[PDB]
Design a protein around this ligand. Sequence first.
Ligand SMILES: Nc1ncnc2c1ncn2[C@@H]1O[C@H](COP(=O)(O)OP(=O)(O)OP(=O)(O)O)[C@@H](O)[C@H]1O
Ligand SMILES: Nc1ncnc2c1ncn2[C@@H]1O[C@H](COP(=O)(O)OP(=O)(O)OP(=O)(O)O)[C@@H](O)[C@H]1O
Ligand SMILES: Nc1ncnc2c1ncn2[C@@H]1O[C@H](COP(=O)(O)OP(=O)(O)OP(=O)(O)O)[C@@H](O)[C@H]1O
Ligand SMILES: [Mg+2]
Ligand SMILES: [Mg+2]
Ligand SMILES: [Mg+2]
Ligand SMILES: [Zn+2]
Ligand SMILES: [Zn+2]
Lengths: 161, 260, 260, 260
Amino acid sequence: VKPWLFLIKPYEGESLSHFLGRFRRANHLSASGLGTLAGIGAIVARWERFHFNPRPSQQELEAIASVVEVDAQRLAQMLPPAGVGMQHEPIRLCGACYAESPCHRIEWQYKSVWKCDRHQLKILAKCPNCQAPFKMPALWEDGCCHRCRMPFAEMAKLQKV
Amino acid sequence: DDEWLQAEIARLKGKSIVPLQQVKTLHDWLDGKRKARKSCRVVGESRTGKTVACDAYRYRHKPQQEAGRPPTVPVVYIRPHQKCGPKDLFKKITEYLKYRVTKGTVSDFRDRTIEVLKGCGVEMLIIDEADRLKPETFADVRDIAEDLGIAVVLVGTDRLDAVIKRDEQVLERFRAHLRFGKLSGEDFKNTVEMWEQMVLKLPVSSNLKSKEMLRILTSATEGYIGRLDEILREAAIRSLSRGLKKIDKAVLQEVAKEYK
Amino acid sequence: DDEWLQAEIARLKGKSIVPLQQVKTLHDWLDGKRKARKSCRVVGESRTGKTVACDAYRYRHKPQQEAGRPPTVPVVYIRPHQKCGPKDLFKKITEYLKYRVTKGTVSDFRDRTIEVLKGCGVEMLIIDEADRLKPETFADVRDIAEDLGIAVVLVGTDRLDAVIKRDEQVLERFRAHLRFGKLSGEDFKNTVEMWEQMVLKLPVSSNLKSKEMLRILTSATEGYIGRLDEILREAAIRSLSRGLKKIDKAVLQEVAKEYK
Amino acid sequence: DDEWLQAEIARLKGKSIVPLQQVKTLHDWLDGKRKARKSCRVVGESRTGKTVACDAYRYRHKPQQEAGRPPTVPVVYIRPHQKCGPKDLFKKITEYLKYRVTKGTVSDFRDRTIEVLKGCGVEMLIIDEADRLKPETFADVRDIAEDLGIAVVLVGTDRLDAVIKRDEQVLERFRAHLRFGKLSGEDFKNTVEMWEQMVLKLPVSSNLKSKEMLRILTSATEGYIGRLDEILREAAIRSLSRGLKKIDKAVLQEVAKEYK
Ligand SMILES: Nc1ncnc2c1ncn2[C@@H]1O[C@H](COP(=O)(O)OP(=O)(O)OP(=O)(O)O)[C@@H](O)[C@H]1O
Ligand SMILES: Nc1ncnc2c1ncn2[C@@H]1O[C@H](COP(=O)(O)OP(=O)(O)OP(=O)(O)O)[C@@H](O)[C@H]1O
Ligand SMILES: Nc1ncnc2c1ncn2[C@@H]1O[C@H](COP(=O)(O)OP(=O)(O)OP(=O)(O)O)[C@@H](O)[C@H]1O
Ligand SMILES: [Mg+2]
Ligand SMILES: [Mg+2]
Ligand SMILES: [Mg+2]
Ligand SMILES: [Zn+2]
Ligand SMILES: [Zn+2]
């Protein structure tokens, strides 16, 4: 037998925040706990809210790669590519893309993205029924608005075309 | 055929919900407590079958998806951890609901659980193994019951009775109490003859709770429905594994020897 | 035949309860004292058959339990061990009602016993071998009979009368008695004939309880029902061990000279 | 008509208090002691009626409470159990005052005991069966009497006299005593006549408590109040059960021969 963890395979276009949240919820860890295990401290707790004041470094991502067992390049593929500007707030979601695959796309957080290219829908910045801003992607235990308990996949037919 | 045998022994080894008279009268009692919104405390000796009855009750009144509002949940079934503080009780009562709270502090958590309880309009709070809670948490349970008008049903063994007798204000509101049944008397005959084919589901040897079988069972179970449950299931596993058609006297005497 | 022989010897080892005028009088008097909560003290010799009569009065009112309330046991029988203290006695009271105890002081045990006693609605408190418990517990049983109003029957040998005589309150409060008789007479012959018919359960060889057999049994048992049971069972088992279908004179002579 | 029989037997099963010169004398004695704050010790025989008369005294002048202030409970009546300790005495003393016990050590228990006693402004403390509680507690009852000035009164059998004899301080402080009488003679006849008038509450049968039944009662009860109660109630219930309207000589003779 060899040391192991509840590994999670990353999605396509998922966020670093959402992937780390899924990794934590499948390992019953905590942001401080994940950081301490990785060896980088509370920096992880920062990444879950997209505060990349000092962009996630190559070392700070290799240390994560050692723990979550995902290749460092595959890790960088959930951060915005070098030079692309993202908004850490508000957290934005497309209902149809969540119904297709239950994840949060880092591409939704780009400053330049307002339309889902494969759904032709104006992506959502707040819950379309109760105007409740979405939580951090790592905090999505499941696909529902916290205040109104409306499933994320449902919101697809409330969001405008 | 060994695949069919393994499926059968998988059914046996799995804990199955089985209808009794006691579970039905418990359900009637709990419906009365719902319509009254009055606190109660079902108590009974170990392995008498309180947990399964409460689970069947909460499955009977399953939560309904509400369209205008977040869904309403009729009953909340929680089994806390041994010597767990009120923070963990609040965590469990929120997590049973679809809601979820992190960070914060104890006062924040109690406020949040008050809000989620009033939002869902929860009728009863069946706490399983109520004596696992720390005595300070019982004050919080009283506060929840008094502020939300929610019927709290304290499920546990006589240790729960001693624990609630230890403190005054905790026992103050739980005047009513339901004592569970040992099932002694002629009821053993009905329960055994029903369990012969209701649960086991094998070609019966027409035991029909025969004198030898019934007396060997009363020498091992003493009315503990859980006892007879696992004894009969394990004995059926032994009989089927060795290639026997139906159970016999030897396997019953062996399992009774290993039990007593 | 060997299996039949084993069944016969096993049955002969097991003791039975034939209802005769002694137990009839005892439980008639017990019902009379129960209907008025009159605390009495039945007394008698040793190895005469008082406990079996008590046992019968205990099982005849087999408790009928409701669906969701504590069972109503009207008659409570306890046989405290040698030098039984108050904690032990209360433990036995609450254990008979199927209420497992919780660790605590003597006051906690007393309170739990009082609670389960009033809740169950007991009518009788039968304390056999009541010459075993300490006198510091007779105050407790006095309080039980006084405040809770439960008729207590102190059962034991004539040494119980000596034990209670040196005390003050227990002798005056418990004064009604029912001494067990010797049974010698024509009723003794009826007893032995009935024992031959039912208890022995042997094939009808027309033993008929002849005069010589009656004289031998009178010289052996000295009027004791227990002595009669032991001698009859020993004779039957010894006859069945040597292949003799019925019970002859040699086995009776052998058991009589073995005993005296 | 059967329901009338049920009402009559229920009334007979319950025990009523019959006024008499002895209880009046006890009332006057306790009034004098409470007005004097004198620690007395009432004594008497077995089945002489001390507990009933003490209950009459505690029931006569009930605590007249203030609307929002603690009740001015003037009299505290307890009968601590066998070998009662100081903590148990405090528990009973605080449970009488309708003040729920707070868990703690003996020091804080005693503190809260003193505080509640002073808050209620108790005048006289009456302790039934005071021959049981251990001598470690008589020091504390002496402390209560000395520092608060409450008339401490002890009930018990004549063994209580020796119990206080073996110790010095309680032997001295509890020096006022009132021996319970035997009440036999012409006063016994008056008691019997008034018992037949009020306690039996049966139709006027012109029995008028004849001399023969006076002799029978003297030979059976020997003048004890409790024995008179027991025998009269048993005779009444036996007469009513068999359909008889009045009491008969045979019934009284039967209940007499069953007691002596
Ligand atoms: N109504 C029932 N139908 C079928 N099985 C039952 C029932 N009640 C109890 N059992 C059996 O009893 C066991 C579990 O009993 P359960 O936990 O409900 O009892 P309990 O008296 O609440 O005791 P404990 O608190 O010690 O768990 C299992 O073997 C289960 O199959
Ligand atoms: N009604 C009965 N029918 C059959 N056997 C009886 C009956 N009563 C007593 N016996 C016999 O008496 C013997 C034991 O009697 P039991 O234990 O009742 O005595 P006891 O009077 O309570 O005295 P002890 O204090 O000496 O035990 C056994 O052999 C039992 O079979
Ligand atoms: N005034 C009364 N009226 C009716 N019955 C009475 C009265 N006084 C005593 N009794 C009877 O006497 C019995 C209770 O007597 P009590 O408890 O006072 O006895 P005691 O001699 O103080 O007892 P102990 O020996 O335990 O100290 C009951 O049967 C009750 O009916
Ligand atoms: Mg259970
Ligand atoms: Mg015996
Ligand atoms: Mg008294
Ligand atoms: Zn989309
Ligand atoms: Zn919402």
